[PDB]
Design a protein around this ligand. Structure first.
Ligand SMILES: [Mg+2]
Ligand SMILES: [Mg+2]
Ligand SMILES: [Mg+2]
Ligand SMILES: [Mg+2]
Ligand SMILES: [Mg+2]
Ligand SMILES: [Mg+2]
Ligand SMILES: [Mg+2]
Ligand SMILES: [Mg+2]
Ligand SMILES: [Mg+2]
Ligand SMILES: [Mg+2]
Ligand SMILES: [Mg+2]
Ligand SMILES: [Mg+2]
Ligand SMILES: [Mg+2]
Ligand SMILES: [Mg+2]
Ligand SMILES: [Mg+2]
Ligand SMILES: [Mg+2]
Ligand SMILES: [Mg+2]
Ligand SMILES: [Mg+2]
Ligand SMILES: [Mg+2]
Ligand SMILES: [Mg+2]
Ligand SMILES: [Mg+2]
Ligand SMILES: [Mg+2]
Ligand SMILES: [Mg+2]
Ligand SMILES: [Mg+2]
Ligand SMILES: [Mg+2]
Ligand SMILES: [Mg+2]
Ligand SMILES: [Mg+2]
Ligand SMILES: [Mg+2]
Ligand SMILES: [Mg+2]
Ligand SMILES: [Mg+2]
Ligand SMILES: [Mg+2]
Ligand SMILES: [Mg+2]
Ligand SMILES: [Mg+2]
Ligand SMILES: [Mg+2]
Ligand SMILES: [Mg+2]
Ligand SMILES: [Mg+2]
Ligand SMILES: [Mg+2]
Ligand SMILES: [Mg+2]
Ligand SMILES: [Mg+2]
Ligand SMILES: [Mg+2]
Ligand SMILES: [Mg+2]
Ligand SMILES: [Mg+2]
Ligand SMILES: [Mg+2]
Ligand SMILES: [Mg+2]
Ligand SMILES: [Mg+2]
Ligand SMILES: [Mg+2]
Ligand SMILES: [Mg+2]
Ligand SMILES: [Mg+2]
Ligand SMILES: [Mg+2]
Ligand SMILES: [Mg+2]
Ligand SMILES: [Mg+2]
Ligand SMILES: [Mg+2]
Ligand SMILES: [Mg+2]
Ligand SMILES: [Mg+2]
Ligand SMILES: [Mg+2]
Ligand SMILES: [Mg+2]
Ligand SMILES: [Mg+2]
Ligand SMILES: [Mg+2]
Ligand SMILES: [Mg+2]
Ligand SMILES: [Mg+2]
Ligand SMILES: [Mg+2]
Ligand SMILES: [Mg+2]
Ligand SMILES: [Mg+2]
Ligand SMILES: [Mg+2]
Ligand SMILES: [Mg+2]
Ligand SMILES: [Mg+2]
Ligand SMILES: [Mg+2]
Ligand SMILES: [Mg+2]
Ligand SMILES: [Mg+2]
Ligand SMILES: [Mg+2]
Ligand SMILES: [Mg+2]
Ligand SMILES: [Mg+2]
Ligand SMILES: [Mg+2]
Ligand SMILES: [Mg+2]
Ligand SMILES: [Mg+2]
Ligand SMILES: [Mg+2]
Ligand SMILES: [Mg+2]
Ligand SMILES: [Mg+2]
Ligand SMILES: [Mg+2]
Ligand SMILES: [Mg+2]
Ligand SMILES: [Mg+2]
Ligand SMILES: [Mg+2]
Ligand SMILES: [Mg+2]
Ligand SMILES: [Mg+2]
Lengths: 260, 205, 127
RNA sequence: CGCGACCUCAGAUCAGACGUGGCGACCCGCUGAAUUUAAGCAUAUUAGUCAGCGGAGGAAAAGAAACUAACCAGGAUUCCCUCAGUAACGGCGAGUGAACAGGGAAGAGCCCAGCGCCGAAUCCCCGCCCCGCGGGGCGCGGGACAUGUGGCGUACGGAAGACCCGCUCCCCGGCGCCGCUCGUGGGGGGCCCAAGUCCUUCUGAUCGAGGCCCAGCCCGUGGACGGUGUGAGGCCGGUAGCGGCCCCCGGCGCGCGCCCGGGUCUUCCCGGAGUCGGGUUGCUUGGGAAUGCAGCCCAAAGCGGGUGGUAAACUCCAUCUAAGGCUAAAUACCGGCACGAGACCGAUAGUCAACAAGUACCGUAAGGGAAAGUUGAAAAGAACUUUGAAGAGAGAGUUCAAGAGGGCGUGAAACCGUUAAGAGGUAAACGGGUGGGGUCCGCGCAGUCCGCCCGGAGGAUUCAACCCGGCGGCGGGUCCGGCCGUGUCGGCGGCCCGGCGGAUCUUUCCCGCCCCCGGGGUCGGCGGGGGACCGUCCCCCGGACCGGCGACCGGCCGCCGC
RNA sequence: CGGCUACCCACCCGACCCGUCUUGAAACACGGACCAAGGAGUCUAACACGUGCGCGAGUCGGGGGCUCGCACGAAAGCCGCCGUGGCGCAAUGAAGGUGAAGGCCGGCGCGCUCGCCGGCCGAGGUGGGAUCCCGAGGCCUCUCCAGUCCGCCGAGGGGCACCACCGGCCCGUCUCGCCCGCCGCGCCGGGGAGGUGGAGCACGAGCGCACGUGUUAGGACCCGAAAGAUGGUGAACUAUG
RNA sequence: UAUAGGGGCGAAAGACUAAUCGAACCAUCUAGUAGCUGGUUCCCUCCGAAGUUUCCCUCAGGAUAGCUGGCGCUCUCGCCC
RNA sequence: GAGCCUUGAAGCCUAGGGCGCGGGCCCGGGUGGAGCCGCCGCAGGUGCAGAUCUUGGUGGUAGUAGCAAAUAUUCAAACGAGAACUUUGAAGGCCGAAGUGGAGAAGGGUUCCAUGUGAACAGCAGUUGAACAUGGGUCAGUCGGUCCUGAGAGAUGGGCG
RNA sequence: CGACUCUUAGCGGUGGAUCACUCGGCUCGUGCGUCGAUGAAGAACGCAGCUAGCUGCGAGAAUUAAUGUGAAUUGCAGGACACAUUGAUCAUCGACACUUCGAACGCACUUGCGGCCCCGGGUUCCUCCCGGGGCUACGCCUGUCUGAGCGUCGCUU
């Protein structure tokens, strides 16, 4: 608001002239003179708590939690059930995370890009984005956002050599870099497991950029991969292991209901 | 107004702070402005390096930061005279000159003098007319570069005096006890009063 | 995707410039495509329409095979009026129907030295 | 008596030139409350702010120390993070509250009065000639300013003058043109890709499935708008170190005008006054035995003066050199000129104002100050007949629709008219329980249940039962035959044909240096480089474990379709 | 034919009109004619506690810098010889300042309400204390023998966390006595035994982000005054020349 | 025509000063403050009070204790004691 | 969500069917014509019965009070669709020269005059008007301002700030 | 039997709530730095063929000239339709113009009253003669001109 409905000079009547105790604009002739002045319950007045510009908008996150979220999103992008449950069409798609040759990053046109997506069967995921490019619901159409266009695959690379030109206007695609991994691009909407397409140099630089549990990251300064909470975490295998079932009481499956 | 066991609070909000709220919404704006300022300087001004003049090795005045070191302001005219060049000739060569900085230590004097010798060795200058005073040919293919970053010499140089391998020695280990500090403290607190009593002992015959 | 920081995707600003564009902009607004044989013969995609162009209406209440000549161009209403396209009032007086020039296929242009210069610039810029 | 010169002066519609006033978001100078808090109110806080007055620029102010510090010292001003809600101030209550460090953006330093030396070598004006595009200067001839002091040389970081040394050959202001540059310098005009194909709904299509085994077509262009609806291709827009022209600014290269610094030695010079400071009194500050500013009085020194945070005396030491001046940068901007975006509002909201809004209107005036958006795709805004004087109807007509007819999208509630149904002396209305009536729903109302197995009744089909032929899958043995995982050695192998880290080494390795006697002394001390050793990955074979989400082949039983 | 139901009517019983101030409202207490829209615990800073996450004796880049000119990019990524800095790892004192390990064994000075030398252990003890360990014993259809097998346990032991108590250590004061060392033998420093004050030590648990509650200051849940100050406009009414 | 706000003017009533005068009007500080009135917006479930101690220029208020809720933690029975 | 739809979204109405205990919801039927929703997270200017609540609209009151200060109207004709009111004739009255008359100053600004309309206005009505639309109208040496000073207001010199 | 009243449903009338749209606001950020004595900001008055407001302009008055683009403005009659002539509209605008008040400037402002110089006519000339053009505010700086001083001095009666 920043300059509210307090532009109208006003006073209260009091006891006599017994409309109310609200301030009233003072004058004559104009039929506004005598109406409700500034205050939250009046016409043309002032809003309750005028939302100032010094609200705490931006929120700092720990960098270890940022890198933890990047590692969690990239790990969840590898399991096929997670990305199929996010909704990408991975029926005819070959082996998980896809590693293409280094001739892909030197594309110049987009016909080769579309042909590559058709040959690697990501064109079904692009066709889903073609099928869903409808109009925005609600009053959000006024502020220049009229397209519900769902996210498709994300191609992650290094050494930009025309791959942004090849993948710049495909609907639903995401331009994304190895050295600058975005959480907002790797997991849009906070839902993990987005379909990603890597490259040879990308898929080799990931280990250089984060490491293993044996060595540190050689590109970052003081980062290690986080220690896993459960080493071998197949709960059904653990509960059907002989060591656990050697030390159980008995399966007690009687009910013993109410006796009248 | 107060409550259960909590800290006594005195906020400084009685003054009309709502008018003067300077919130950094233009902080990426200033960042992009200052990036373009530095890049426009490095493009248009010269093939001089960014952060142009060379800064001295300087110790910080405290009992707190004097173990550390700092890039100072200028080269302390006695130091520049020992290096042997004129003042504004040094300023145009690229030497930062501060006429206020004195010289107490011959150690820091010779440190800045050797730093000047290193900078004059690393200097490659280009005069206007191609008669070549104080240069030669295209040395190192015009030096292979024309821009340095974050100081010319990285002027920190945190010295590592190690002095590791030595054997524990004779009666200094039985001589350097705690009582030396208390004796020095008592001597510093009672220096002048003993001199007054000695003067009175010489006076009263 | 829009990459210039000096042009709007803004709906209010685009509609404001569109409905308050001056006449030299409204001529570029009221541009019409060409027939396939004339674009094959001239190597140009579209032209601004003028007073004496021949028009085949492609869409609306009248569709195709009605190659007539325009008579008036209201640039204030973004409306050309075509001689063949008629509609009677209540009182039996005919009046021309509003046709937007983007739903108009030009079959023949009007020859002029200025239009030859425009056609040469179109062909050279299409290259 | 008169004439002349200087000095104080006055006049003009004298020749030429300059200030007024406006905006005022940012900045500078003065001034200045009170509501409020202290649960009361005087000190205090609100506040060195609101209001008032005076000034200018795109920035202003400040700015080259009469500084900070007190130790291994730094070193113009501004701005941010810290210092820090700390030192300190305060009816020591409420509350108020910096700074030096240190890390960052920026980096630029300088000039004058005095001291003397130069024959005032200086500057303004008038007139003619050398001359230039769009306009103004180097010379020529005389009227002034200035010796009560112009200009050069000079500035506290020392300077100047005369010998000796060995060198430098310099600059900045015109004028035509060349290829340019990091967005491929500034802005302005005009132009640049690809279905409008076939079928069908629709008033209208931008809707609906498809366009050959190369995915109909363009894409460095799938942002957005208008178009009769929901568009990448139908249209200006969008991408592009895409392209052509016109206009403007910069830095190369022909003439006119200026052109002596460094080191040694000798001599000489060396500084801002009613100012600092002291007393006193007001305001202000965190500044307290008084931080800053100001009034009155007293009012200097030259081994001086100020600062050194508790007043005063003596003494030592550190640092600076005031009472003269200029200066871009980072910084601020709710006014203005264009510009872009929005987890914002959507006509009682958002600016008072989406509209002939500071408008209508009110008050003498200072001033106060609104309500008010939407027909349709296109007016195609209803021709014509008829009743009435007209307002208004009845027909007819346009449109997909007047169930859109000129404040006309949608059209609720309160309220009212009529129709249909029901009831009526305890004002109306309500909760529990039924009964009656009415609208409406599901169903066929003596005729409505399904799914499996088996024994009978009639017709038609081909597997299954068993085997041969075949691909695909599960399962495990020899883990045959190979990959990969875990500790462990070894080849110390890529240690010189390797990565990372170590205030663990090597003065018998090297270089730039210091010390002692051009050479010698590890004799000792600093820095850099080579390697020496420690803690994880890169190949190998060999064993041990796991053959486990790591997977192939050979074979086996048990699945399976054709 | 069936049908509860926001349709209507009748009948029996019960049933004063809501909201708040109040001990007490249907009140002869106040507000409400009716209807539609708007309308009241927000935001910032600070603190405390709890919860959730990351790292963990460390933690955090919020301040800048680096990436090619990209719509989302005012995002995100990185700095490490950017950790300066904030908080914590150290407290106690007004301050000068000082500043948290003790115990055992053997030898000796008169083991003397007393100091020295060598070696060892190491954050002390008591009573409770989840859990954990050893295990008497007996228990599996008809003969001795065995291994896991069905199957617990008397009694004992080490004792997490935390509670109570005792003891020890540090800092400032208080009382009493003796000793040691000299970059120089002094109104020099240090030490000992008890009694107290501390927000301490006695193997450290913090940092950052987010969410919830509460408090404080800001207009602070909304509306409300009699009042005060600053700057301007009126003698066209009236009062007086 | 002159006197303009703590001012004017008053044969004096504190009367008049533009329907307002025991201090005019307009705008700003200002959304002044209030321990004092009125109001405070969806459902269900579970628990559920006090008008009392002490202190205050305290008596219509607040602080503290008490009453209450929420979040847990440490344990114990679950096989003649 | 390969979500819904111009073969009809939001919105609204509903003696329809139903669910939940409720916050509310789903479907049927009718207008409507272009946008809307389910799930997981996210963020609020997020829920109304009151505040002598603000804005806007509408009832009972109610076809009620009221259209009563100043003596008063009546007949005929005309224009007109239409006359208690307009115009004319005639009669009867009032104001009665300190006027219900003829003209000015201040103030109003076209209200003055002619023609036409009667939906607005005149508190009933009009064929009428100071309403509306169209078109006209104010002529100065000798009327006044202009000139002069009156109480007073005011700038330079000057002083103060 | 009807009237009145009550409760629903349909239709109709007041009403403009909800929903949908937005040439409008609000917030944030970037770029530039611009008023006037050569008449600013502001105000008055006037200007269109039919023209009240807003917008645009200043007696050249809904714009003039020039450049760019290229066949219109439009509600209606008109008019240049010419383009192998100069060419309608629109944008830019760098050239011309810009009434009066206003810092406002000849005095005060009652559109009042002057005063100089020059040019055209009216008695071919001023002598308080009509029209037109230029000038006429305060403060101040530099220089020129004029002159006041028993302020100081030289020479001279
Ligand atoms: Mg305000
Ligand atoms: Mg206000
Ligand atoms: Mg508002
Ligand atoms: Mg909605
Ligand atoms: Mg409380
Ligand atoms: Mg305040
Ligand atoms: Mg906008
Ligand atoms: Mg001014
Ligand atoms: Mg109070
Ligand atoms: Mg008081
Ligand atoms: Mg103060
Ligand atoms: Mg002010
Ligand atoms: Mg300016
Ligand atoms: Mg100086
Ligand atoms: Mg702190
Ligand atoms: Mg306090
Ligand atoms: Mg203060
Ligand atoms: Mg589109
Ligand atoms: Mg569209
Ligand atoms: Mg196109
Ligand atoms: Mg002195
Ligand atoms: Mg001194
Ligand atoms: Mg001292
Ligand atoms: Mg002192
Ligand atoms: Mg100075
Ligand atoms: Mg100065
Ligand atoms: Mg600046
Ligand atoms: Mg609305
Ligand atoms: Mg509004
Ligand atoms: Mg339309
Ligand atoms: Mg008729
Ligand atoms: Mg319809
Ligand atoms: Mg309507
Ligand atoms: Mg409709
Ligand atoms: Mg519509
Ligand atoms: Mg209705
Ligand atoms: Mg009835
Ligand atoms: Mg009660
Ligand atoms: Mg009572
Ligand atoms: Mg009541
Ligand atoms: Mg009432
Ligand atoms: Mg509401
Ligand atoms: Mg916590
Ligand atoms: Mg540190
Ligand atoms: Mg108030
Ligand atoms: Mg007071
Ligand atoms: Mg005043
Ligand atoms: Mg009077
Ligand atoms: Mg009187
Ligand atoms: Mg007062
Ligand atoms: Mg009165
Ligand atoms: Mg009073
Ligand atoms: Mg007062
Ligand atoms: Mg309030
Ligand atoms: Mg209970
Ligand atoms: Mg008491
Ligand atoms: Mg009490
Ligand atoms: Mg009460
Ligand atoms: Mg309590
Ligand atoms: Mg409890
Ligand atoms: Mg829903
Ligand atoms: Mg609200
Ligand atoms: Mg919102
Ligand atoms: Mg309501
Ligand atoms: Mg309520
Ligand atoms: Mg009310
Ligand atoms: Mg009424
Ligand atoms: Mg009656
Ligand atoms: Mg009556
Ligand atoms: Mg008759
Ligand atoms: Mg008649
Ligand atoms: Mg009579
Ligand atoms: Mg009379
Ligand atoms: Mg008439
Ligand atoms: Mg009437
Ligand atoms: Mg008349
Ligand atoms: Mg009229
Ligand atoms: Mg006459
Ligand atoms: Mg006269
Ligand atoms: Mg005066
Ligand atoms: Mg004066
Ligand atoms: Mg309205
Ligand atoms: Mg023209
Ligand atoms: Mg004249």
């Amino acid at each position: 608001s920043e300059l509210a409905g307090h532009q109208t000079s006003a006073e209260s009547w009091g006891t006599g002239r017994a409309v109310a105790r609200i301030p009233r604009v003072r004058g004559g002739g104009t039929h506004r003179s005598g109406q409700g002045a500034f205050g939250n319950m009046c016409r043309g007045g002032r809003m309750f708590a005028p939302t100032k510009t010094w609200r705490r908008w931006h929120r700092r996150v720990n960098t270890t939690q940022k890198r933890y979220a990047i590692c969690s999103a990239l790990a969840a992008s590898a399991l096929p059930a997670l990305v199929m449950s996010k909704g990408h069409r991975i029926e005819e798609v070959p082996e998980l995370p896809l590693v293409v040759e280094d001739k892909v990053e030197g594309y110049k046109k987009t016909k080769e890009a579309v042909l590559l997506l058709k040959k690697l069967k990501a064109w079904n995921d692009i066709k889903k984005v073609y099928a869903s490019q409808r109009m925005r619901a609600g009053k959000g159409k006024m502020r220049n956002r009229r397209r519900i266009q769902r996210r498709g695959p994300c191609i992650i690379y290094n050494e930009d050599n025309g791959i942004i030109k090849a993948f710049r206007n495909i609907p639903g695609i995401t331009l994304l870099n190895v050295s600058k991994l975005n959480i907002l691009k790797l997991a849009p909407g906070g839902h993990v497991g987005r379909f990603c397409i890597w490259t040879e140099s990308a898929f080799r630089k990931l280990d250089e950029l984060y490491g293993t549990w044996r060595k540190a990251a050689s590109l970052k300064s003081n980062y290690n991969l986080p220690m896993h909470k459960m080493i071998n975490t197949d709960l059904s295998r653990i509960l059907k292991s002989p060591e656990i079932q050697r030390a159980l009481r008995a399966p007690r499956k009687k009910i013993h209901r109410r006796v009248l | 107004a107060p409550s259960r066991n909590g800290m006594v609070l005195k906020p400084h909000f009685h003054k009309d702070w709502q008018r003067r709220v300077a919130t950094w919404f233009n902080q990426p704006a200033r960042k992009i402005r200052r990036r373009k300022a530095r890049q426009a300087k490095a493009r248009r001004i010269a093939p001089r390096p960014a952060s142009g003049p060379i800064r001295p090795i300087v110790r910080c005045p405290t009992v707190r930061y004097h173990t550390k070191v700092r890039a100072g302001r200028g080269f302390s005219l006695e130091e520049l005279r020992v290096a042997g060049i004129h003042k504004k000739v040094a300023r145009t060569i690229g030497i930062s000159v501060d006429p206020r900085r004195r010289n107490k230590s011959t150690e820091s004097l010779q440190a800045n003098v050797q730093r000047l010798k290193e900078y004059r060795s690393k200097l490659i200058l280009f005069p206007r007319k191609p008669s070549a005073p104080k240069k030669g040919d295209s040395s190192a293919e015009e030096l292979k570069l024309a821009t340095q970053l974050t100081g010319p010499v990285m002027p920190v140089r945190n010295v590592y005096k190690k002095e590791k391998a030595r054997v524990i020695t004779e009666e200094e280990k039985n001589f350097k006890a705690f009582a030396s500090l208390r004796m020095a403290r008592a001597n510093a607190r009672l220096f002048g009063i003993r001199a007054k009593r000695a003067k009175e002992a010489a006076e009263q015959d | 995707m829009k990459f210039n920081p000096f042009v709007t995707s803004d709906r209010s600003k685009n509609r404001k410039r569109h409905f308050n564009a001056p006449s030299h902009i409204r001529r570029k607004i009221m541009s019409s495509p060409l027939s396939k044989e004339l674009r094959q013969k001239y190597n140009v995609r579209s032209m601004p329409i003028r007073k004496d162009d021949e028009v085949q209406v492609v869409r609306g209440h009248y569709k195709g095979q009605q190659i007539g000549k325009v008579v008036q161009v209201y640039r204030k209403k973004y409306v050309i009026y075509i001689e063949r396209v008629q509609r009677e009032k209540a009182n039996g007086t005919t009046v021309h129907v509003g046709i937007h020039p983007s739903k108009v296929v030009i079959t023949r242009l009007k020859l002029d030295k200025d239009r030859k210069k425009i056609l040469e610039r179109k062909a050279k810029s299409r290259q």
